[model samples]
Target chain A: VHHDGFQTVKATIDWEHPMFKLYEKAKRNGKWNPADIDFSQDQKDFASLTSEEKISALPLVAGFSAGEEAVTLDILPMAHALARQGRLEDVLFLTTFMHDEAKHVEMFSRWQQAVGIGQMDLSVFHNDHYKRIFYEALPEAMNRLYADDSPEAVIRAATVYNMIVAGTLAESGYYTFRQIYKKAGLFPGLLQGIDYLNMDEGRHIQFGIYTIQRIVNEDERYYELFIRYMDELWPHVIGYVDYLTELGKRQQQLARTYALEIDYDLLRHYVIKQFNLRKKQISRT
Target chain B: VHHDGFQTVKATIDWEHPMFKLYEKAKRNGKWNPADIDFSQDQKDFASLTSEEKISALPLVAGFSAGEEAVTLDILPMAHALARQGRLEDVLFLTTFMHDEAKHVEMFSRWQQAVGIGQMDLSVFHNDHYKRIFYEALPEAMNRLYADDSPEAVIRAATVYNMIVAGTLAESGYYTFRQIYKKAGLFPGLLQGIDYLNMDEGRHIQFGIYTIQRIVNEDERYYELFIRYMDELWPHVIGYVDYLTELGKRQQQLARTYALEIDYDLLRHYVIKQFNLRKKQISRT
Candidate 1:
């Protein structure tokens, strides 16, 4: 359990453990059809929004849609690495993880189509900051595991993927979207899907924390690797979120014009809190 | 569709075409629970066979079970490659592909457990021929796609995966399996699962052939790469199946003792027919 490598064919699903239960939960709650989300009302609601509001939100939506696709596509190699490690339960759980990601991609893409932004030039959303992190660094770090599946590579990947992307950015992004959409009373269907996505990501973040702690426990050097990766990638993580700075300013001005009670400072504070909580969870593990 | 790089996000599932219909069929018919497949009867039937017959069949089952797992583990890179191509339909189709492969792995592993061969030293089943193909060469060829995703590399991967593995060996192996198991009336549930797997693989082989043909159509040099890869890997493919030569002899002797009819040469002929059909299909595309 301290390391990734083990081989056993035991079929006894120990219902006594959290990993097995997580797998069960995944199967039960993960059965969502992207087409089931009715986006008709959301389309109308989006049309009613101000031009500034539309412009401000479109980048976030586009970024999230493609981000989900990127994560869905990148996660398989880690699953492959785990399958090679011979952890049957971990593999079983990760199968659900990948499946959930695929569903998320479908869900986001469907939403984009519903909002009439499906074929818009998404490259506009992929700012240099976002491109550096998601387009360049994330795939490079994760795909590096295929060739160099060393402990350092694994930690670096998890840091880029589960720890930073999923844990910090995704969680904060969901919170931001939920708050803004809920306040505006727009896109209930999208909000509901995001809620499900948030839950799915919670389990993924927990799994990542468990993996990191187990690897570090196996050899303390991996802990150093974890720190090193975080150091290398943290600025990019911050940069990815900060690409929303212009949008955030415009959004705040629009909110003021609409007399909307939105607090950008509070949202930023929550993001920092959430990330600190993620780090604490990993360390505690 | 000329090459693999297209970006379209339109949500129109045209059921008129085979690929779209295949994806639908996969979603509907691919639902099966590994836990639900009753294997008690399989366990009894396996025990009823003679020791030599049991030993002979064990390798086939073990090889297939591991092969399913390998395919499940290896297919993600191809999916990632296709995602980068921005072929959403192909990406959607590949989601089902990976899911089906995972199910196949689960089904085979569950059968192994039922037959009381789950934790037995399966190393005995991994003969040199099996090792060269499944254990070593197959992965090296497929994993190379992550780094060297040139046209030559993509064609080489499909050649190894679909053309050689699924198109030739797996189809032949399944035909051989159905013949033996049908004659013996053994493991009906296992056979049923294989039936679904075979149908699922039909779509996969077609997709592979389409991919290879399309790549070759883009540049005639890729046709040479296809031929070159097949030429280089064909010997290993032959060697892989030929590893069962001793087991085949034992199985035939056991069949005679049990008054059951068997046809080794007929199976060989069927294998050749399958490969020829595969080549013709690719060429026609």
Candidate 2:
């Protein structure tokens, strides 16, 4: 049943819950300005990279640039869903999610401008893999919440959005970035921004799983829907991950003398572990 | 056409437009706390009022309480539409709009609690007229934009929301509150809250007219669609106003010794002026 109207409603901010605490923490800690990050080192590093390394970097940056935008645009429906359910603390947390995604978009855009690719055509960055996951699958899943608003729909949306996109792919990608960037000892500013984004996204994924767990606690039907959606969307996510790995492998070969190493096996392990943990969290009693 | 992806996007934070300026202004000025408002006087005033006067006041506050929640819920679609169109300034302004409506909802709920009507069955408050306008018509119009996202859809949504609901009805309601409370010389806290809400709403109406004007500028078809929706919804709006006026007339008679005067002619005039001004603003080239 729908919650009572605001007249009789009361929320104590539920400080004990991780979601509410994260919402408060996000308000205090997650506030950052894109322009405040000095990208001069990134600019210098981009220019000094081999042409092949630079080309590989372009798609990575481009994919993230558009990915952030997609999430920012697609996230509101889920927030509205929580609002309609009268889950005030969840709505409050989701608002930070929206704001953080926007800032991520802004940060990446600022990076592109710093590297002098701000006006570059990024349509070419969307390979079949990227296009299928971001352009088609993500929007469709999230927009379903607007019309359906069923428990199944919400679980399906969270699976595709929080589990696959942000949890699996983004976490794996950040792992790769930390390994590569730390080894190269380059782009400290970019790494720092990504570090903050990783924190913000971690909370988002946590909230998503929390929501799924709560939903499934109420009804097993939602859990079944969650597993079903994860199974359906896994291949697309895997395809996208493999494409990025292939790029990493090629770039590693090109810059082997520079010791640019990317182990797809390790990356895949991380991605799978990420997905497995998310499912476990949601399935937990 | 929608703006290109965020990679090629850049915003200089244009402060010239009223929408952008109002957004900045709202950030600086509209911060408020419902708990901070001293409602002891309002509680005293409500207790001293006659039963009829008290009953009459419930619907007015109840309608606005639910109306603020409705607006808060429905506004996301419009903000999403603007974001899809890549209108940055407008979207920034709308964020403030959402925040303000939530505060308004909180303010009204606190008022209800302070007056010992917090847990009162508000089903009696949603008279047929209030139910038709808020529960049925308002959501139907605002939610349509999510599906269609067409110019005609936008215009229709804006007409229902900006023109009729926020513009004509709310403006008239505020005027009524100003007159009644000033004469009563009570409920300073309530009046103060309403005054802040009024300022916030004025900016919202301004933003709405600005959006409509820009849309009509792009195509006169939007203007035609707007006029059609306004015409269709106007009767329901008038019905709501008349219901309030009838309540006012009854309360005025029953509380005549209390000097609770309500001039329907004045309210109608004020409402007509509100509508005329809104139409003129939207029709401007």
Candidate 3:
């Protein structure tokens, strides 16, 4: 039984399914837990593969699917807030970002699985490092922008926050997926996932930049802060780029050692293109 | 008792003294509705005046003070769709708006009583027209903005709505009071009432505009809609502006006719300036 894994289970009895009988038997027998379903040694052994190997073996590239999930968990709440609060323009921009981010989550994790690798742990992902750096600090930035007593302070603050959350993280994830996926192989599924993520991020970043400009006009001070923050955040952000580059380089060496051809075209076409586009959007030197 | 007027109490509490008591005696009485209070004839009489005439009156402003009425209302519950599903941010913004709006109900309405005027009739203020336009539509706007599918759309919608509700009406209300209070020579206790309203509306409008701009993008189609709607609803959006304008003008006319010289400069500087500023912000043309 593949019971240790997540799946659909029926609450009612049905003769067509063995699981239904098992459920009824368990209820009468006074013991029920998914872990008690049991599995063959071989089945357990198959489930023990690394995430990278899993990604490499996945029937479908998980980029877009993962991105969708990430967007739902990360950005949808904010998007809903904007919409319900009557921030129609911001809502549109945030929707695109949500989709892109969700795709990144799926694609990046999928890549690790494909290459016989796995994430450190869920707790690591949810660490204070991530929470403090992204969530807590981000709100502080937003609060600073809004703390202005000017007429348009709120508008400017909202716009800046959207840009930081959507434009930076979502857009960065796009290039990372493509770079990693390309090193794995043409891997049609991975390529497809990365491409979809890239498209979504492109739309979101565009909207974010547009919002930033609008709020910038609301107050001169806000624009200055935006510029300063962009400059300050760039170094820490580029550290993300550095890590990705190191990963890409290591993957390239591994592929060569294994006599596998790396798809440099995907990197040039998908990965680098996203960076260039974002750099242009930010007007980065 | 003169009872100033129950404008503030009428909206927030039925019986002022008892509601205060109920707060302390929550264990003794399980549920408390504002309807339990009794209003003297003077208090009931004041609720029948036009909004403008109500403002210029006295004796009605001082009686309904629930400064400690922190019995929080779940504004999200007001919208059935999000009653159970709302996020923390939605709740935060709603809570803030409710507190601020309640202050407006208290202070501005209190000014009328201080001048011996009264509150608007409960039936009229809660009538179909007011409910459909202000009461219903306003809350719905909050709900939709929070639950929108797109970040850009949410921000844009929020900002547009904010520009009207907070920037235009609430913000202008502050300006009016500031103008009135700076020259408090004529109206002895009027400035204090205005001070309460001005402070509350200041925060409300600031938060509203900030929320909207953050969500909406500069280039999004919703921005166009925002610009359009603000202009379209210019009259109704700044409903309070006209109310204040009429009161100020009437007061100035009265001062000139009766030769009271009750400091029109303070009003012209405060209330008139506010009207002009609010008019400019909401008007695209």
Top candidate on DockQ is 1
Error of 2 at A221 (Å): 5.5
Go through the candidates in order and give each one's DockQ: 0.16, 0.15, 0.01
DockQ (0 to 1) for model 3:
0.01
List the global CA lDDT of all models: 0.70, 0.73, 0.37
List, residue by residue over A87-140, the lDDT tens digit for candidate 1.
556766777787677667767766767777766665666667676667777778
lDDT of 2 by residue, A31-68 (tens): 56555789999999888877777776666676777778
Candidate 1 TM-score to native: 0.83
B177-216 per-residue lDDT for model 1 (tens digits)? 8888867788887887788789888878877887898888
List residue ranges in candidate 3 displaced over 4 A: A1-132, A139-169, A218-221, A243-254, A257-285, B1-285
What are the runs in model 2 whose C-alpha is more than 4 Å off?
A: A1-57, A76-100, A145-150, A173-199, A221-225, A249-268, B1-56, B76-100, B173-196, B248-268
Q: Kindly give the stretch of ten consecutive residues in candidate 2 chain B with the minimal lDDT sum.
A: B1-10
Clash pairs, candidate 2, are none
* Ranked candidates, highest TM-score first: 1, 2, 3
Q: Give the TM-score of candidate 2.
A: 0.77
TM-scores of chain B alone in all candidate structures, in the order given: 0.89, 0.91, 0.50
Of the candidates numbered 2 and 3, which has the greater DockQ value? 2
